[PDB]
Amino acid sequence: SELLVNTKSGKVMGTRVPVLSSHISAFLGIPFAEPPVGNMRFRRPEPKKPWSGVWNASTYPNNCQQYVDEQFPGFSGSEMWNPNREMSEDCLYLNIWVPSPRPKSTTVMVWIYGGGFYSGSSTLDVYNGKYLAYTEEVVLVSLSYRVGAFGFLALHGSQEAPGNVGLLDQRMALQWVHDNIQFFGGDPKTVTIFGESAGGASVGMHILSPGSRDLFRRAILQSGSPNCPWASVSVAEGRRRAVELGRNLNCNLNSDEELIHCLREKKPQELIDVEWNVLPFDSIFRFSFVPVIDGEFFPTSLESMLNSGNFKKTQILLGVNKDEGSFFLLYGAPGFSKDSESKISREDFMSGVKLSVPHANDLGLDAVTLQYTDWMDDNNGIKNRDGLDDIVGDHNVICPLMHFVNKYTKFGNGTYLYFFNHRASNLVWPEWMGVIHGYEIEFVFGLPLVKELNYTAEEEALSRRIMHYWATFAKTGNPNEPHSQESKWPLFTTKEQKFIDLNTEPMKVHQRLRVQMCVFWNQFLPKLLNAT
Amino acid sequence: SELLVNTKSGKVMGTRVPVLSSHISAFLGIPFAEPPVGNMRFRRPEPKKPWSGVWNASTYPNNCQQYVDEQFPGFSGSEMWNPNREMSEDCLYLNIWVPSPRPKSTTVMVWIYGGGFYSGSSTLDVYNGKYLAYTEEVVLVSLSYRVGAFGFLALHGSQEAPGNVGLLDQRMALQWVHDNIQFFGGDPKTVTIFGESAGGASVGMHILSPGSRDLFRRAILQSGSPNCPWASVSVAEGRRRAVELGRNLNCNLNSDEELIHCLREKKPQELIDVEWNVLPFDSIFRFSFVPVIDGEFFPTSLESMLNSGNFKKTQILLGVNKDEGSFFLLYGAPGFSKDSESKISREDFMSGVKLSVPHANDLGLDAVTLQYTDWMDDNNGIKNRDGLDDIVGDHNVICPLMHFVNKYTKFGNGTYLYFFNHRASNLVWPEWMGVIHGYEIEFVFGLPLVKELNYTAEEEALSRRIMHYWATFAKTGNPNEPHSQESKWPLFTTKEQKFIDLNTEPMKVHQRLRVQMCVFWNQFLPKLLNAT
């Protein structure tokens, strides 16, 4: 039957799902790892023992244990990111949307969710593969991985909690797609992995890590970048945070075996309750347990890997949203509130600059401030608010991604760069927040096509325009249709540095995206801080 | 007779001079000090022994010994600043233009020439008091002072070369005006001292120095400021430069008496030949022998004097030109030439930034560069050229003057601030140079009124407009006529920070003149350099 597939791990039985007055197939909650529970918590992932019989792969799986956002209880804008299924340490599953009929060798797209490495779910309504798989004839796959302390506790030199295991989770799901996607009609030599936020930093991490490169063909990174300041810590810092997690749960801290044993005795929610207490600074856009530069998953420092062409050479498609910082100021910066225009006093701007660059000494704090303050009108709370939005977007997302895209292009086989600056017309967050972090996802997955979600026709036009760029890129390494009538999304070159707009207005091409500020973040401020 | 005046130092006989189809009186080359020759070279000035008989005060006096510009031999644009009379160490004289008939108590204006403390002449055609004295009924006085090593060699703790003597020259001329200007129909309680460049820094120095404040009423500073980075050195630096002058002339350097004796044996031109060899850096807009912060003329550091209201509280009128730096790049920066548009390579911009901020470490050099580079179009030789013009104007003139005007206004009785941005229509320098340092002088002295110098009628209108602002300010402490029809030049307040334009277009009022860049120069870069 269509909904029955003989994989190398065993048979699985999916279900027929409707999608825009037609139907396709779905295989939800397929295991790719052994459940990482008990003594396996914090351990590298093991591959799922193959099973006899048939797996009832018709319902979504548990979500992995994480912190749940309750800043705005009941508010859909915040709830759509929380787990919509019960949480279990047994989260290692993946979901396949297959067109119907089952093709024989179409393009495969693997989705990697974000959420700062401390949260995420493959099962969110905004991650639904069906609209994309159906509209573009691709096989859509979404994996899951251990987040939080469960996926990134880092006592290096120990083999019980080596770090990076949530990436190894991702890797094993990618190994399972390479081995088995052919039985779902997927071409295992045409897998494009894409992600956003932490998931975009993951996608670019698999580009760097050698153990990962041969498991996928090309890559899409959305608002994420392996070298983001929040995406990785050093071994010393990862150890310190692991030890401090132990101290919050009154653990014996003498040996690494003593810490790890103590942490496995604890229930999940006990580590989540104190997870945020181990950050070294008062900060925004910093998360506790993140990938560690370990010498194994990452052979050396990320900057030397980027300078020395030490990474998978292929094509990449990547880009940013207009107002990336505003979501994070809402959560931790003083002055901002969901229900005001959040005009920002001179004094609260000062406070935001501290929380955005928590590693900076006073002289660096002054440098940031000078660079982002209109001094002809300093006490303007809209200019102070918008300025903060740019401080957090540039430092944390846009400028580390530009650095990545300038370093990668020097050695790669193609690069396509976008600037998504369309405020969705049905957005529940205040208008001061602009074009929000993670709000292009709904267009990439084609939710505008559900003309029951209140979307303007132009936005459906935009979602189809975008979904085609993505799929055509995953299929060929160029989002442009050969012999096509629309304007061509130009390649990004070190010489000309072009990129395009993604909005309902006719496509436009600019260059050197936010270079002015990105010179400051990528080259000046690091030099200043290194100087004492 | 009109041209005969009985001063406290003796009678003097002036001459009748024509000025715009009428006539007034002039007393040229009146001594106010003993000739500072032989053993008096480098010494504080002594007052002119009074004389029997009558002084033939009808011809201009010698100019003081200085370096003569020969970068452009024959070119009037450069020659109009060189000495037009033979040079003598006996330069201590002053010149009075008196209206006719001799008024009884009109306003007195004393002019203090500039030229980096290393050059200047009271006798230049652009300093002619007659057009101003006649048009505005004021008594115009111009002093002279020892420049170069002759006026500012600084072996502190010695009484033979204590430093600052060229300012004491100025002071004695001001004491002579206070004592004697009443016999020329001048009101000695209404003396406004004005100057440009070094002369504007002098005017503001007499505001700070206590030994000077009671000798003048109010003050005009043009493109000059006591706290300019070139206007003063520390005692240690002034000693080092004095010792290095000795080393260039093969002097015994053991004792201060030995150095000073050796330097007095030398002819003047021997010190001028090597004067530039003692600067500590490769620089532009730095001069060898300048005022020294000595504890006497200046009680303490200039910044503490400005912070602690330690200065003459009165009214001041001051301002800057649009393109102050371009004159100095022409002389020492690579890429610039009198006869090209001087488009500036990326590499030669780099070189200019070095020569403009010679005291800055590499990190400071990067800060300047970042702040003044359009990174969306970095290899634009017009933007690099104009950018350099602003680097040198802001650092050396505009931003130290804004600092002065922000500190002085906090404690003073009035402040008026101008931005002179009219390119004179008959200017012999290339158009890339813009509105050049020291090219408002010709409007302040009313040379546009000579409709035989090729000036547009609008410019005569501007010169009369400006000459009236100056004189009416000197007379009252407000450039505005009471009950007048033109727009009012607003006072400068710490709150609103207004200022006006000086050009042929109808007057306009802006605020916070070049604050963006001046925050960087006055508050950020000093913090950065102090930090290691």
Ligand SMILES: COc1cc2cc(NC(=O)[C@@H]3CCC[C@H](NCc4ccccc4)C3)c(=O)oc2cc1OC
């Ligand atoms: C003391 O440190 C704490 C820090 C934080 C940070 C929280 N959240 C966030 O930083 C982010 C902000 C941006 C919106 C994002 N969700 C939407 C989203 C998800 C995925 C992709 C795209 C968009 C939540 C947080 O919920 O709780 C915290 C609690 C803390 O202590 C108890």
Ligand SMILES: COc1cc2cc(NC(=O)[C@@H]3CCC[C@H](NCc4ccccc4)C3)c(=O)oc2cc1OC
């Ligand atoms: C190695 O250091 C040297 C440095 C210099 C600098 C010279 N000149 C100037 O810096 C200035 C630049 C601006 C134009 C001004 N004159 C017009 C002016 C005069 C008064 C008020 C306003 C305007 C001359 C110079 O002539 O010769 C130099 C020779 C050097 O070594 C032999």
Ligand SMILES: *[C@@H]1O[C@H](CO)[C@@H](O)[C@H](O)[C@H]1NC(C)=O
């Ligand atoms: C699969 O599990 C769900 C959830 O309990 C159940 O409702 C469904 O009928 C099951 N289907 C099969 C074929 O086992």
Ligand SMILES: *[C@@H]1O[C@H](CO)[C@@H](O)[C@H](O)[C@H]1NC(C)=O
């Ligand atoms: C003053 O000196 C000049 C220059 O030598 C001379 O030509 C002039 O006639 C003299 N006048 C008097 C009155 O001495």
